[PDB]
Amino acid sequence: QTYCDRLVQDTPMLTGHGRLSEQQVDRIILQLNRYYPQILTNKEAEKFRNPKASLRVRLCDLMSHLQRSGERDCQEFYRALYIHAQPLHSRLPSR
């Protein structure tokens, strides 16, 4: 599977309530913003960290963003997920 295909497959599980916490998501966003490649701009990172919007809505929007942005971005997401949510990372069905 390509990483894009994996992400499409894993999206319903990843976005299920309880799977990722706000703290995990926040750290994933930082991982995708602060380094190289930069997957998320500062403005995008702030949007996805916005405390006023429900976490699930922000996550679904993040998944859509990564899927449209291509293979490299999806690969970086999986690395960020390994770093900040290893238990979940290990349980994903595309594994």
Total Cβ atoms within 10 A of residue 3: 20
Give CA–CA dist 7/29, Å, rounded. Answer: 16
Containing 83, the helix (H) or strand (E) segment is helix 71-84
| Experimental technique of record | X-ray
Give CA–CA dist 3/76, Å, rounded. Answer: 9
Per-domain boundaries in the chain: 1-95
Give CA–CA dist 59/80, Å, rounded. Answer: 14
HEC per residue, 6-75? HHHHHHHHHCCCCCCCHHHHHHHHHHHHCCCCCCCCHHHHHHHCCCCCCHHHHHHHHHHHHHHHCHHHHH
**How far apart, in Å, are the Cα atoms of 54 and each of 19, 59, 61?**
14, 9, 11
CATH class of 1-95: mainly alpha
Residues with Cβ < 8 Å from 19, sequence gap 6 or more?
A: 13, 88
Q: Are 10 and 95 in contact (CB under 8 A)?
A: no
